[PDB]
Amino acid sequence: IGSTAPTCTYNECRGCRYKCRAEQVPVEGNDPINSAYHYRCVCHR
């Protein structure tokens, strides 16, 4: 749908040891032009 559909692949968290997942993280809101949404990988429990 956007860029990282298949998350960042648990390897994205190579090191920790909990639940790994990636998601979209916008910064410039969205109402105005759409050009500021990236994706990152996180490792929480």
From Swiss-Prot:
Q: Indicate the segments annotated as coiled coil, or none if absent.
A: none
Covered range within the whole protein? 58 to 102 of 102
Can you name the source organism?
Arabidopsis thaliana
Q: What is this protein called?
A: Stomagen
Function (record text): Positively regulates stomatal density and patterning. Acts by competing with EPF2 (AC Q8LC53) for the same receptors, ERECTA (AC Q42371) and TMM (AC Q9SSD1). Not cleaved by the protease CRSP (AC Q9LNU1).
Q: Which cysteines are joined by disulfide bonds?
A: C8-C41, C13-C20, C16-C43
Gene encoding this chain?
A: EPFL9
